[PDB]
């Protein structure tokens, strides 16, 4: 009892009903995958300028 092996028929009709939705942009993307050495120091750099702008309201 053989039967059809495979086809992509009808598959891009289905994809296009609800979709091919564009990639979803964001300001401020994640640091996921970013160099720890960079990111460790960056954690302190920001904490530094955050502490700055606090003593800028006193």
């Amino acid at each position: 009892a053989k039967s059809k092996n495979h086809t992509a028929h009808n598959q891009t009709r289905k994809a296009h009903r609800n979709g091919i939705k564009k990639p979803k942009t964001y300001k401020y993307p994640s640091l996921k995958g970013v160099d720890p050495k960079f990111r460790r120091n960056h954690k302190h750099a920001l904490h530094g300028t955050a502490k700055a702008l606090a003593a800028a309201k006193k």
Binding site: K14, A15, K21, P23, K24, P29, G33, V34, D35
Partner: protein, 159 residues
């Protein structure tokens, strides 16, 4: 049975550009990349380490990170009916700076010029791009140029 390995089908895709083999010239490593640059991906068969998978051949992305020998790139690869975010770790040999934005960067500092140099003159700008318009009317002269009348030629053979 079928064979689906990582570099399958990539015969000519990773080939070397005729009479371009050998070392990569030294500029490739002097180029400098920062987070946010758009890079084009073309894999170099000579450098087997840090090689992009063949799917990302001919693909443009944005560097998200920078390491000793490498830049990370993010690519929107679309699977099913959506896009997912792939981030790639590439040796610099596989990556060149993209010209895709240079006509935009040229046009920004150009549109800034004719903006100032107009407003300070009293406006009248028009800096949006327009498509090719149909051409205007014109008068073609017959001077030294009379129409040369052509006709269809008959059937010949000559072999």
């Amino acid at each position: 049975g079928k064979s689906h390995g990582y570099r399958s089908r990539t015969r000519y895709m990773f080939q070397r550009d005729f009479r371009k083999h050998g070392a990569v010239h030294l500029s490739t490593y002097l180029k400098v990349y920062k987070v946010g640059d758009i890079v084009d991906i073309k894999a170099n068969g000579s450098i087997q380490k840090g090689m992009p998978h063949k799917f990302y051949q001919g693909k443009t992305g944005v560097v998200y990170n920078v390491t000793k020998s490498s830049v990370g790139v993010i690519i929107n690869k679309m699977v099913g009916n959506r896009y997912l975010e792939k981030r790639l770790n590439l040796r610099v040999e596989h990556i060149k700076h993209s010209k895709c934005r240079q006509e935009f960067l040229e046009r920004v500092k150009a549109n800034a010029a004719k903006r100032a140099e107009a407003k300070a003159q009293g406006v009248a700008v028009q800096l949006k791009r327009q498509p090719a318009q149909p051409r205007e009317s014109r008068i073609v002269s017959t001077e030294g140029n009379v129409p040369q009348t052509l006709a269809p030629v008959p059937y010949e053979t000559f072999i």
